[PDB]
């Protein structure tokens, strides 16, 4: 809510692995992942019809 | 050859009559011999143009054949639409795929259709799904309030309207832009250069104007594309295409472009009365945005482009423009791009 | 009941070397002096569409004859006039054929002439001769054919 951008999923991912890693990833891509993430029969049967 | 005009030939015509051995011959206008000396100059001439031109043709078509440098094709237009219903709907509804949108308007009988699936859940009063303009030209780009048709539509749906213009069609590519990307592969051939690596991350086709900024034993491009995003896939592509490219022994790194937001709340003086309207309102802020996208990377927010840009739609109509507070030109850095901003019109 | 027109063509039509052969005079005719009236003071319909990439569009506007010659580029005004005014009767409302004459076709040609004679100088812009020159031919067959049109008529 407070910030330019939210979604529950995305912030959701970043929080799995956050907590799996026991807040310390082995890689700073973990907190870019929420900033880069966020920012036929009928017509087939006709057109034959049409051909023939 | 040397152009050469009706007068010419025909004087020349008449020089050789003359001398050869004729002098009861005249060349009075009326005369039957000088309406076929003028009609065979106009032949002449008629084919010396028409060479020229298949000089012309022939030059461009041996600088297509030659090499392996063509223009790609036009991008089809796209757009959102947004629909009314009369009431929230109670259950969920499905549309079904390939659904046809189109406008009553002749002037623009162009259709529209839909590439996915989309579902209308229930307790909403509107939905907004896109579409894309089947004919591949710049007719898809219809002004505001023109798709205002559905096939195959239920009776709850009170009203179709698209909110903003598409202004996203194209033709075929321009002549310059095709000439300008045929230069920086020119330029490019010698490899191990700023205009190398330039050319190497220009030729992806989704990639629109990159930036390269060379610290010391240290290159890095800043890529983007027409959103303004980088995708981790087309990245990996790109790295990838500049291996090729890349200097030997010298280190490269990428990190997209960080956008930034300014409001231009610009103000436009119009010639004639009757015609303003929200409509042409709502025509210049769309027009005004789209300038602000499909910008490239690392070059100032110059006034003098923007002022011509939007005075372009109508000499006439439009009769001057000014500004507020951005009449000096925002310098960008590297890592800036400019294309998000709020656009508030202030007619006097 | 008239069709609309494009913006390019209504923009354009709302407004020391010498030929030796042909030669202007600034001549305007009857028919195409009503027309002129008509547009400036009515608003007539246009269209929102540029799909025809031919005649004035890039060709006459792109040249440079605009601001080089500006008597030069007036000449080309008075034929357009002068061609639009002669199609505008045949195809819808044929009551303002009555004021053309002979005579307002023959000047017409030999302003044409002049101008285009003035084009073959310049090497780069000879595509609008290419049509210049067709048009030339029509004309005439305007010319040797309009009085027998009005008797039959």
Redesign the interface.
Known sequence: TKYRFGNKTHATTLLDEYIKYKGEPPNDEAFDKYL?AI??PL?MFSRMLFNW | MK?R???NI?SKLIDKTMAGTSKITDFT?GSASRSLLEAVS?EI??FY?LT??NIDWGIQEGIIEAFDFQKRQSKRAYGDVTIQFYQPLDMRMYIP??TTFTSTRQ?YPQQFETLVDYYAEPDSTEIVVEVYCKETGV?GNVPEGTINTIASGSSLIRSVNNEYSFNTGTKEESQEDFKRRFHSFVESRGRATNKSVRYGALQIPDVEGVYVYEETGHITVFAHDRNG?LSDTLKEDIIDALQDYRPSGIMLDVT?VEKEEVNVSATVTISNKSRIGDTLQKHIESVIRSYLNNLKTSDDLIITDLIQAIMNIDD?LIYDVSFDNLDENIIVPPQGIIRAGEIKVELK | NFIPQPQGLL?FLNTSFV???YTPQLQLSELAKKVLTNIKTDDIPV???E?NDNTIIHKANDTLLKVQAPRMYMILQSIVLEAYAIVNCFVENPSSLKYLTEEDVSITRENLNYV??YL??Y?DY??V??DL?DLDLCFSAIELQLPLIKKEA
């Open positions: 880069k920012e036929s017509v | 152009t005009k009706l007068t025909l206008p106009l001439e008629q143009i020229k031109e795929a390939g002037e007719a995003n997209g006439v | 923009r030929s030796k052969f269209l929102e569409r799909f285009a004679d073959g100088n090497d000879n595509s001769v290419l020159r």
